[PDB]
C-alpha cells in the first residue's frame, strides 16, 4: 500500500510537472507570438513569381 501511494502521489507529481511545462510553453510562445505571426503573413503575402529554372526558350 505504501509503494502504491508514494510514487502514486508522484503520479500527481508527474501531473504537477506536466502542468508547469505546459504553462511554460504557453508563456514562452506569447512573448513573440505577434512577431512570428507577422513574419509568416509577410512571407505568404510576398508572392515572388518565378519561371522554372529549366525553361529554355
Amino acid at each position: 500500500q505504501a509503494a502504491m501511494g508514494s510514487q502514486g502521489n508522484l503520479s500527481a507529481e508527474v501531473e504537477q510537472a506536466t502542468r508547469r511545462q505546459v504553462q511554460g510553453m504557453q508563456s514562452s510562445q506569447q512573448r513573440n507570438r505577434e512577431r512570428v505571426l507577422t513574419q509568416l503573413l509577410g512571407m505568404v503575402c510576398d508572392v515572388r513569381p518565378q519561371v522554372h529554372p529549366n525553361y529554355r526558350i
Binding site: 529554372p53 529549366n54 525553361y55
Partner: protein, 600 residues
C-alpha cells in the same frame, strides 16, 4: 558546351542535345554539377553514369560537357595531400566547408590555386630552343625532401617562345609558352593526364636494384626489386602494419603512395591517423613522412566509380613521379576491394558475368595494372631513370586462394610475401609463413649481389635448405622425441630454431632493431650458417668410432658462442658504425671456428 537532361532511370541519366561528346568523357550533371561519365551514345543523346546520388535531378537540367576523360591533375601541391579515388582533395573539402561530409556535387580543384610556389627555371633553356615531351624546364621547391620537377606534358613539343623568370607563381599562371607549326600552347605548372592511359617512357628496363626494406625476413630470403610487383595477404591477424610502416618509413625509394580502394571507414581512419605520425631520419633531421608521401583514401561507401578508379588514380600519380627520375613505391591496401567495385559496375551495366561472378575481363584489367610497374628510362633529354614498385595486398572473402582475384594476382606478381596469423598469435613478427612465400627476382638480383656482397647468395640458399629440412624433420621428431635421431639432424633442428629466433624474427619496437642494414643482415646470416657448417663437419668427421663429437658436447662446450650468435641482433647501427659491427661479427666468426677447433 551544355546539353540537357532527357531522363533519369536511377543512377543512369539520359542527356539530349549532346552530340559533341566522346565515350568515357566527363559530364557535370544538373545544378549541383554531379560527376559522371558517358558510356553509351546514340544520335545526339548520351547515356550518363552518375557516380553520386541522382535524387533531385530534373528533366531539362543542364549537363556540362568536359572534354577530358577521367584524368588526374598533376602538379605542385600533390605531395602531402589526401585524395578521393577520382582526385578530390579531402583535406581541402573538410577545411573549405567546415563540414564533416563530402558535399554532393562538391567541386574542389585537385590542386589549390591560392599557393604561390617557388619556381626556379632550369637556366639552361633559352627562347628559340627546342624542347620535347618529358623535358624538364624548371623545379618547384615544395619541401626539404622531394623536388617537384616541372616536365613538358607528354604528346607536346615545339620551340620555346617564353620562359618565366625565377619567382613566385601559382598553379593558374603561365610558366612556359611553346609554338609548334604556328600553334602556340600556353602551359602552367599543372598537366592533366587521362587516368586510364599509360604515361609513355623511352624504354622499359629490367629491374636489378634491390628494394632495401628494413626487415631481415622479406629481404634475405624473399627479395623485392625496385620496379617489381609483389602481393601481400591482408587479414586482421597478419600484422600487415609491419610491412606498411617499414616500407614507408625506411625504404630506399623516394616517394611513397598509399592507395585505398574501398575499405571499412575505421580502417581508412587508422591509415590516415597513423601516417601523419610517422617520421624518419633524413639528413640527420627527423622529418614527417607526409612530406614525401601521397595518399588516396576510399571507404566502402564511396561512389563505386571512385573505388574502381582509385587503383588507376594511384598508379597515375606514381608514374608522374616516375617520370621525374624518382623511385616510387605504391601500396594498394586491398586489390580485393577494387575487384569488388569493378564487379559492381559490371552488374550495373548488365554485363554477362564470368568466373565466380566477376567480369570476363578481370584478368585483363589486373594484368594491365601490374604491367605499368617497372624500371624505365624516362622521357626527355635529361636521360634520367626511375621505377614504380607495387606491393598491393589481397584479401579474398573467406581467406581462400580460389577467388579469381587472388588467383589472378598470384599469376601476375613475381613476389608473394605470404603472411600468417598463427605466427602473430605466437607473437612472432614479422608474421612471414616462409613455406608459402616466394620471390622470382632472385636471378635478376644475382648480378647486384655478386658485385657487392659475393657470399650472400650461397647463404640464402643454405638458409632455405635448413628451414625446409626443419619442416621435413617435423614428422620424425613427433614420432621420436629427438631420441632415435641423427646428431646431424639435431644440428639442423636447433640451428634452424636459432635462425627463426635471432634472425628471421625482428622486433620493430626496439630502437636498435628498427631497421637492419643489409650488411648487418648478411653478417648475421653468415655467422649462423658458418656455425651450421662447422657443427656438421665437427660431427661428421668424427662420427666413425671411438671418439665422436655430438650436439650435447657442442652445445655444452661452446654455450658462450651460441649466446654471442643470439646477441648479434643487438648491434645498433645508430651507435655502432659499419666498421665496428663488422669487426665484432668477424670476432664471433673467429671465436666460433676456434671453439669447434678445440674439439678436434
Amino acid at each position: 558546351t551544355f546539353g540537357y537532361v532527357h531522363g533519369v532511370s536511377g543512377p543512369v541519366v539520359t542527356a539530349c542535345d549532346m552530340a559533341g561528346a566522346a565515350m568515357y568523357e566527363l559530364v557535370r550533371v544538373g545544378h549541383s554539377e554531379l560527376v559522371g561519365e558517358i558510356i553509351r551514345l546514340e544520335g545526339d543523346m548520351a547515356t550518363i553514369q552518375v557516380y553520386e546520388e541522382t535524387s533531385g535531378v530534373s528533366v531539362g537540367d543542364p549537363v556540362l560537357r568536359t572534354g577530358k576523360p577521367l584524368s588526374v591533375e598533376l602538379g605542385p601541391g600533390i605531395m602531402g595531400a589526401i585524395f578521393d579515388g577520382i582526385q578530390r582533395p579531402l583535406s581541402d573539402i573538410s577545411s573549405q566547408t567546415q563540414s564533416i561530409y563530402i558535399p554532393r556535387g562538391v567541386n574542389v580543384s585537385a590542386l589549390s590555386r591560392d599557393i604561390k610556389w617557388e619556381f626556379i627555371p632550369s637556366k639552361n633553356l633559352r627562347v628559340g630552343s627546342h624542347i620535347t615531351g618529358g623535358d624538364i624546364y624548371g623545379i618547384v621547391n615544395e619541401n626539404s625532401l622531394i623536388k617537384h620537377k616541372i616536365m613538358l606534358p607528354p604528346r607536346s613539343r615545339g620551340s620555346v617562345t617564353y620562359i618565366a623568370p625565377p619567382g613566385n607563381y601559382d598553379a593558374s599562371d603561365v610558366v612556359l609558352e611553346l609554338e609548334f607549326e604556328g600553334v602556340k600552347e600556353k602551359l602552367s605548372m599543372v598537366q592533366v593526364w587521362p587516368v586510364r592511359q599509360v604515361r609513355p617512357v623511352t624504354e622499359k628496363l629490367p629491374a636489378n636494384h634491390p628494394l632495401l626494406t628494413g626487415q631481415r625476413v622479406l629481404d634475405a630470403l624473399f627479395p623485392c626489386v625496385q620496379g617489381g610487383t609483389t602481393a601481400i595477404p591482408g587479414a586482421f591477424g597478419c600484422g600487415k602494419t609491419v610491412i606498411s610502416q617499414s616500407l614507408s618509413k625506411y625504404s630506399n625509394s623516394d616517394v611513397i603512395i598509399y592507395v585505398g580502394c574501398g575499405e571499412r571507414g575505421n580502417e581508412m581512419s587508422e591509415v590516415l591517423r597513423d601516417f601523419p605520425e610517422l617520421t624518419m631520419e633524413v639528413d640527420g633531421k627527423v622529418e614527417s613522412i607526409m612530406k614525401r608521401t601521397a595518399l588516396v583514401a576510399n571507404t566502402s561507401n564511396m561512389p563505386v566509380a571512385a573505388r574502381e578508379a582509385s587503383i588507376y588514380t594511384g598508379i597515375t600519380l606514381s608514374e608522374y613521379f616516375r617520370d621525374m627520375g624518382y623511385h616510387v613505391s605504391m601500396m594498394a591496401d586491398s586489390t580485393s576491394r577494387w575487384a569488388e567495385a569493378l564487379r559492381e559496375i559490371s552488374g550495373r551495366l548488365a554485363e554477362m558475368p564470368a568466373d565466380s561472378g566477376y567480369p570476363a575481363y578481370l584478368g585483363a584489367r589486373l594484368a594491365s595494372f601490374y604491367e605499368r610497374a617497372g624500371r624505365v628510362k624516362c622521357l626527355g633529354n635529361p636521360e634520367r631513370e626511375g621505377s614504380v614498385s607495387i606491393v598491393g595486398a589481397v584479401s579474398p572473402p573467406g581467406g581462400d586462394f580460389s577467388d579469381p582475384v587472388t588467383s589472378a594476382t598470384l599469376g601476375i606478381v613475381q613476389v608473394f610475401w605470404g603472411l600468417d596469423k598463427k605466427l602473430a598469435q605466437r607473437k612472432h613478427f614479422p608474421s612471414v609463413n616462409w613455406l608459402i612465400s616466394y620471390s622470382k627476382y632472385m636471378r635478376a638480383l644475382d648480378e647486384y649481389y655478386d658485385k657487392h656482397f659475393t657470399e650472400f647468395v650461397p647463404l640464402r640458399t643454405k638458409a632455405k635448405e635448413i628451414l625446409q629440412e626443419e619442416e621435413d624433420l617435423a614428422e620424425i621428431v613427433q614420432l621420436v622425441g629427438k631420441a632415435s635421431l641423427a646428431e646431424t639432424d639435431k644440428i639442423t633442428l636447433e640451428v634452424a630454431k636459432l635462425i627463426k629466433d635471432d634472425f628471421l624474427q625482428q622486433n620493430g619496437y626496439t630502437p636498435y632493431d628498427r631497421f637492419c642494414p643489409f650488411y648487418k643482415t648478411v653478417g648475421m646470416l653468415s655467422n649462423m650458417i658458418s656455425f651450421y657448417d662447422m657443427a656438421r663437419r665437427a660431427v661428421e668427421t668424427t662420427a666413425q668410432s671411438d671418439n665422436k663429437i655430438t650436439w650435447s658436447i657442442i652445445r655444452e662446450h661452446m654455450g658462450e658462442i651460441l649466446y654471442k650468435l643470439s646477441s648479434m641482433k643487438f648491434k645498433d647501427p645508430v651507435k655502432d658504425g659499419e666498421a665496428k659491427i663488422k669487426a665484432d661479427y668477424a670476432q664471433l666468426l673467429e671465436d666460433m671456428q676456434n671453439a669447434f677447433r678445440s674439439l678436434e
